[PDB]
Amino acid sequence: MGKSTLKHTRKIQILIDLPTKDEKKEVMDMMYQWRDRCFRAANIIVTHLYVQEMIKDFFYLSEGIKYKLADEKKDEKGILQRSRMNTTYRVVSDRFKGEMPTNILSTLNHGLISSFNKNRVQ
DNA sequence: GTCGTTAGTTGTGGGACTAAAGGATATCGTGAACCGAAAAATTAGTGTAACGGGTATCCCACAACGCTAG
């Protein structure tokens, strides 16, 4: 069956449901920290998904090697030790865990790794 | 005999002359010379290119997951 839906987005205002000011402020500061960690994360993922392609290019300029993004346990020419999205998610979680939730990391990882493969041509 | 009055001319001046349509004209004669006025035309003079961050907008492409284990 075809897609019988069209994606849509709505803006819902939310207040923090706490009695006192200090708890609300603690939650709001935690969420601002979440913002900062998310942006630093996005930077880390994009750098870490740039570098390896240029390592591929380096090897190809060395001996025309056909190195490709795949787990070496599943590919002879693979260099990665796991799935690429897992590599970015790991290299961001190992540093930013315990401060902001990991679902933000997973969503950001998917959102950037999906687009970067399309941007490979450019 | 003479002077004002009245009526009847007599000459002279001012005012009329359907309605409807249409509706073209041609218009001489010559004396000079200098000064002033304003309206017009010609001429003389000055010139950019990219750059730093930071941020307002545009076009243009893509995303907006699903499953398993502690």
The 3-state DSSP composition of chain A as helix, strand, coil percent (nearest 5) reads 60, 5, 35
Distance A86 CA to B18 C1' (A): 121
Distance A86 CA to B68 C1' (A): 15
Resolution in A: 2.9
Please state whether strand B lies within 7 Å of residue A109 at its CB atom.
yes
Rounded Cα distance, A57 and A62, in Å: 8
A21 is written with which tokens?
A: 């000011």
Please state whether strand B lies within 7 Å of residue A7 at its CB atom.
yes
Please state whether strand B lies within 7 Å of residue A101 at its CB atom.
no
Would you list the DSSP string of A6-56?
-------------SSHHHHHHHHHHHHHHHHHHHHHHHHHHHHHHHHHHHH
Rounded Cα distance, A78 and A55, in Å: 12
